Design a protein around this nucleic acid. Structure first.
Lengths: 54, 217, 259, 98, 54, 333
RNA sequence: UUCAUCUAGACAGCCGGACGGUGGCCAUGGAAGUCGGAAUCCGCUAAGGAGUGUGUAACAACUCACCGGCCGAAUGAACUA
RNA sequence: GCUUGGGCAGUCAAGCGCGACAUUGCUAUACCGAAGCAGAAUUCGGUAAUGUUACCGCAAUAGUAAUUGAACUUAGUACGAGAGGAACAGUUCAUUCGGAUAAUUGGUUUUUGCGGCUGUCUAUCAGGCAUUGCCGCGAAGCUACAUCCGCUGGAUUAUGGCUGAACGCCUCUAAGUCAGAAUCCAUGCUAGAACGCGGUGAU
């Protein structure tokens, strides 16, 4: 537990091989997941209120 | 030389082991680490016997013998005695103590030349071929260890007793702790003239003291 | 944060909400170490890093919020008795919502304090990182400006002028302490790899079964014969007994005066 | 039950059987002091896996910290075979077994 | 399901895109680092290069 | 209790009927799958456990076992079953030319008063060259993708007054049902030893009706993973002369079993207690599949067997020891 | 339904340009558009926010908005049923 | 067609002097996704008569179960400045519950059993009477402080992916597709439709 160990390890070795592609795919899928949640799901009312506030 | 080993994640090697210059006795079990503890330094130089006394893993605490012989308490079964006899050559003498008692390793500590105990004296001398003679300890065996090169005793041992035993034993004696300060010296390590086994908790000063007393270097 | 905690607490449902808020506040307060009471050395070290005034302000704000929530809970047709619950819940939510600043400040320090290079006070002590890595950090043997300055509560020098730092600056910055060295060369006297540690140790301390033959290794020795454990009496070639205890059945049974 | 160590305790006070560890108190400064204890004798015979019906003279046990550190330096009287093997610490201070 | 050939890298070639792609996906998805930090731990096998045999 | 064993109603049939049979193997040769026997007595068994890394590894261990009377089973016919949407159906059955007296009695309730008109025309029908029976055999060969063999036990051999054989079906896990029927044709009116099915250390399951407690009891129950400690055989030497004892003596407790006769014929020793009391009819089945575990693979090392008298109490192993313990007796001299 | 682009080349996808005072002023242990505070200019060119993001203790490297080239007809933003 | 989680005063202003999101002063287990998750530990979210007679058989249908923890081994290894410390898999045990049994032990009770004996009698020979004789020992039965065992294949919720339009990008989804839950169905187990069925011995 030093001042910065995870960051040091990442700099020395790097992130995961598919981290960028996986993150981009997750971001793309979030668009469809938002619609699925809106059409699905108390929880549904809260999600609708949050979306309206956004 | 001295080695650091374990048994079932337990550092009480002496409880489940009894080393001798010609053989070694260990408790039954599939733990390869315990066998490696004695096989690493010398390979298969001397036989290793996986057995038990009265069907217990405290064989180390229940056994008290030397390279020239072995002794077992009355509780030992006939089958176990036969297995021990088959597992050792005719050179090693094996006999059963018929006296009312069970803990032999916690009462008797001896080496290839001398033996210390809390008649049976003649039997002990004959089986081990050693002279039979600690600081008022209730259980000398559980808090003592001995070897031809040297011996180790509990830290609370009196200096006068250590000096007297060393003069009688003709070799130096040192009192120290084992397994990171544990006072049960006879339960945390087993040593012979050329191999010492100690638990993981054994700290560097304890290992150095054990090496120095037996003067391996 | 404040918003997430409020939702988490309220999603489980009146005194239970207050009890949960009190428990969370106590865990936050007790879990966090008091900056002004840890230890003099560590207290000062934390002071140089974090805003001690802001830390105390956040702790006081959390305590006051907990006290206000407890006070509100203690103080507290169908609609008439129903509106009271909504009013109390809204009061609690409004009180909790005022913790965004102290909680935001505590978020930064909560993670930082979890992986500090903290060591016990009793522990013995120009590109010094290279030497630090080489030596070992635990080596058991046998705001930035103020943080660095607090080392007063060893020094390193370079014979050359590596890193672009002037020798005069190094000499001036010096003003027991051991100096390690990797008109210009004469001013160095104004001060007055394990070898250095060895020298400093002074002050640091002052601070398988066989048989007779393997011909019959396959024998099992049943150990029982007609219900008697004969193994205990399996003596080798008992010639005297074989006659003494076997001739009786003919020599003495002939008389047979048992009746 | 009687105490199975040389600590001098008159008696021990709290189903638990031989080899089981439960909280115990020294009924007779130690009054109302709770400490784990291990039963070494129960004066009753059960169906042993070895087939031998063991027996004892009286109920007995040892008082020790949660890790099993024996308070005394020795054990008075016999110790159950199962208990002695189960606890290496008890075996070290055990003098006789059954 | 596709062929295996060869650096510390595997090469998969097959006439059917679906078969080889699914095999690579299954190979990547068996090395799940359960109950472990995703960033700190990088051990596993991941898809790196795609292209035609020719 | 257990909802799976409800409703708790009295069993209609005294003899338990097997509900399932081990999956057929198309490559293995024709072989039997189940055996019939009668529970008889109970005793203690000791051995040494070779299980690796066990608390009793390479050391003695004791427990209780039960003995089931398993006289040789003699086949009486073969039954064929076809696959239909409504379930397995029996299309044709062929019986042996000759049948045992017990088999004939089984088909009677007033045997003493009846004319004993057992298989007469069917038996007389066998006087033909064989075309009629061979025609049915060929029909079974074409159809009946799954086959079963009907057998019965020798009640007369057992020490019971029932004198009425029990009929049951035995499934074959062989392949090429044509080969199955061909094998059956060559074993009509033939007795099959127990060893042909089971062996030492084998894992089987026994089904029988539990004891009636005067509604409590009298329900069929199944116990799986029942290790066969020993497979007794009357043709061999005294079953008590184990490899670790090699001394001739009968396994039967001295003075006879409690409320049961002596056992000399083929028998099986089963680990644990089989459901039901003595004098029952217990069907032995080979677990319906292959159980992979150290429990099934581990062998048995019977160092000692308890065969002393048990009518209330007993201490001697053989009658010759009764006087030896008490010394010379008047009746002795 | 109301507006914007539209054969002076509609939306989209790739390639290229994406600058000079300059690393604006203060803040500097090092922060140069992107750890921070306050204005946001001229020169321009078909196109540069003293900078919308990723990133390094600072540069480094990519970038969208802004245009051009390869592209070819309708496209886009907001509302009503 | 009940129902489920702040008042006061001011700025708001898509729309219709009222009016939206913000906003200012008081008053259990298991499996997945995220966290500065270094390991462990932890937190947040999601899943949950019938022809008579006798035998051998099928199964429409109803019920269903296992369960909690501990030890070697992976290990004092990956991890980490040290403190501390994984998991998968291969093994060994114990606790709860359930189907059964009495082989040892044991509470047990009409052996209403065995040697002696009490008040006493035709006195040891024989125990008569003592609603049930007594002492010590002790069968059968109830029955546990007694013992055996307690299963494996698919389809799936959430979840992670492959190919790939809507929208010439893109996408786990729209057409298709792989893995996957203490979830479903299957294997097994218990009963066998007085009114479901097949074969066989007998006139």
């Amino acid at each position: 537990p030093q001042n910065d160990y995870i960051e040091r390890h990442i700099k020395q070795h790097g992130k995961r091989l598919d981290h960028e592609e996986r993150k981009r795919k997750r971001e793309a899928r979030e668009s469809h997941k938002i619609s699925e949640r809106a059409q699905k799901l108390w929880k549904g009312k809260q999600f609708a209120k949050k979306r309206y506030a956004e | 030389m001295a080695t650091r080993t374990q048994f079932e994640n337990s550092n009480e090697i002496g409880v489940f082991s009894k080393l001798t210059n010609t053989y070694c006795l260990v408790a039954v079990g599939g733990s390869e680490n315990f066998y490696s503890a004695f096989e690493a330094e010398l390979g298969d130089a001397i036989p290793i016997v996986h057995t038990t006394i009265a069907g217990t893993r405290i064989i180390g605490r229940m056994t008290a013998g030397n390279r020239r012989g072995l002794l077992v308490p009355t509780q030992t079964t006939d089958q176990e005695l036969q297995h021990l006899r088959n597992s050792l050559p005719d050179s090693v003498k094996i006999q059963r103590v018929e006296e009312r008692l069970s803990a032999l390793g916690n009462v008797i500590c001896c080496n290839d030349y001398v033996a210390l105990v809390h008649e049976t004296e003649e039997l002990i001398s004959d089986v081990l071929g050693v002279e039979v003679f600690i600081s008022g300890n209730i259980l000398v065996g559980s808090y003592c260890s001995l070897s031809n090169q040297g011996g180790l005793v509990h830290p609370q041992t009196s200096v006068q007793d250590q000096e007297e035993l060393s003069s009688l034993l003709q070799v130096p004696l040192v009192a120290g702790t084992v397994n990171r300060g544990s006072s049960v010296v006879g339960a945390g390590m087993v040593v012979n003239d050329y191999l010492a086994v100690t638990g993981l908790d054994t700290t560097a000063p304890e290992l150095s003291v054990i090496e120095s007393i037996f003067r391996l270097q | 944060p404040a918003n997430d905690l409020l939702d988490i607490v309220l999603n489980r449902t009146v005194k239970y909400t207050g009890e949960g808020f009190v428990e969370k506040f106590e865990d936050i307060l007790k879990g966090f170490p008091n900056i002004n009471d840890v230890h003099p050395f560590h207290r000062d070290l934390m002071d140089t890093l974090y805003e001690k005034n802001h830390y105390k302000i956040s702790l006081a704000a959390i305590s006051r919020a907990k006290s206000l929530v407890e006070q509100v809970a203690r103080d507290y047709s169908l609609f008439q008795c129903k509106q009271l619950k909504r009013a109390a819940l809204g009061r609690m939510a409004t009180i909790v919502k005022k913790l965004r600043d102290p909680l935001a400040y505590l978020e930064q320090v909560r993670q930082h304090i979890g992986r500090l290079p903290s060591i016990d006070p009793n522990t013995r002590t120009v590109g010094k990182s290279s030497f630090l890595r080489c030596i070992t950090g635990h080596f058991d043997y046998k705001n930035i400006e103020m943080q660095s300055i607090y080392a007063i509560a060893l020094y390193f020098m370079d014979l050359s002028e590596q890193c672009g730092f002037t020798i005069e600056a190094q000499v001036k910055l010096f003003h027991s302490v051991m100096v390690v060295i990797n008109e210009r060369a004469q001013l160095l006297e104004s001060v007055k790899v394990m070898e250095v540690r060895n020298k400093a140790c002074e002050k640091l301390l002052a601070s398988k079964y066989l048989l007779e033959d393997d011909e019959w290794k396959n024998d099992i020795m049943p150990e029982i014969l007609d219900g008697k454990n004969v193994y205990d009496f399996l003596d080798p070639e008992i010639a005297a007994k074989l006659q003494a205890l076997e001739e009786e059945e003919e020599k003495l049974e002939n008389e047979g005066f048992y009746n | 039950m009687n105490c199975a160590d040389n600590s001098g305790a008159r008696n021990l006070y709290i189903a638990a059987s031989l080899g089981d560890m439960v909280m115990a108190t020294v009924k007779k400064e130690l009054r109302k002091k709770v400490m784990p204890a291990i039963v070494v004798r129960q004066a009753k015979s059960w169906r042993r896996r070895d087939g031998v019906f063991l027996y004892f003279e009286d109920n007995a046990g040892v008082i020790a910290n949660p890790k099993g550190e024996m308070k005394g330096s020795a054990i008075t009287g016999p110790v159950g075979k199962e208990c002695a093997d189960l606890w290496p610490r008890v075996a070290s201070n055990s003098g006789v077994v059954v | 399901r596709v062929t295996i050939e060869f650096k510390d890298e595997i090469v998969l070639s097959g006439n059917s895109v679906e078969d080889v792609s699914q095999n690579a996906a299954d190979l990547q998805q068996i090395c799940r680092v359960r109950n472990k930090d995703i960033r700190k731990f990088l051990d596993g096998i991941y898809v790196s290069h795609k292209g035609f045999i020719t | 209790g257990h909802l799976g064993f409800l409703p708790r109603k009295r069993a209609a049939s005294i003899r338990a009927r097997v509900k399932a049979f081990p999956k057929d193997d198309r490559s293995k040769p024709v072989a039997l799958t189940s055996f019939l026997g009668y529970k008889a007595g109970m005793t203690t068994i000791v051995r040494d456990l070779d299980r690796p890394g066990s608390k009793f590894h390479k050391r003695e261990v004791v427990e209780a076992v039960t003995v089931v009377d398993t006289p040789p089973v003699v086949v009486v016919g073969v039954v064929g079953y076809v696959e239909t949407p409504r379930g397995l159906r029996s299309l044709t059955t062929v019986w042996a030319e000759h049948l045992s007296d017990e088999v004939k009695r089984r088909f009677y309730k007033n045997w003493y008063k009846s004319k004993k008109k057992a298989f007469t025309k069917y038996s007389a029908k066998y006087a033909q060259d064989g075309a009629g029976i061979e025609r049915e055999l060929a029909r079974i060969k074409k159809y009946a993708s799954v086959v079963r063999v009907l057998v019965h036990t020798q009640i007369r051999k057992t020490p019971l007054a029932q004198k009425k054989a029990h009929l049951a079906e035995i499934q074959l896990n062989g392949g090429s049902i044509s080969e199955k029927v061909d094998w059956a044709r060559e074993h009509f009116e033939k007795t099959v030893a127990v060893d042909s099915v089971f062996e030492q250390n084998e894992m089987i399951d026994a089904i029988a009706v539990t004891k009636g407690h005067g509604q409590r009891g009298y329900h069929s129950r199944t116990s799986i993973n029942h290790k066969i400690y020993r497979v007794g055989k009357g043709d061999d030497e005294a079953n008590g002369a184990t490899s670790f004892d090699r001394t001739k003596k009968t396994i039967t407790p001295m003075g006879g079993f409690v409320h049961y006769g002596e056992i000399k014929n083929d028998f099986i020793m089963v680990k644990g207690c089989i459901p039901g009391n003595r004098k029952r009819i217990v069907t032995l089945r080979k677990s319906l599949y292959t159980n992979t575990s150290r429990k099934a693979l581990e062998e048995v090392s019977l160092k000692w067997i308890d065969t002393a008298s048990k009518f209330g109490k007993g201490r001697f192993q053989t009658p010759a020891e009764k006087h030896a313990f008490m010394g010379t007796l008047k009746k002795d001299l």
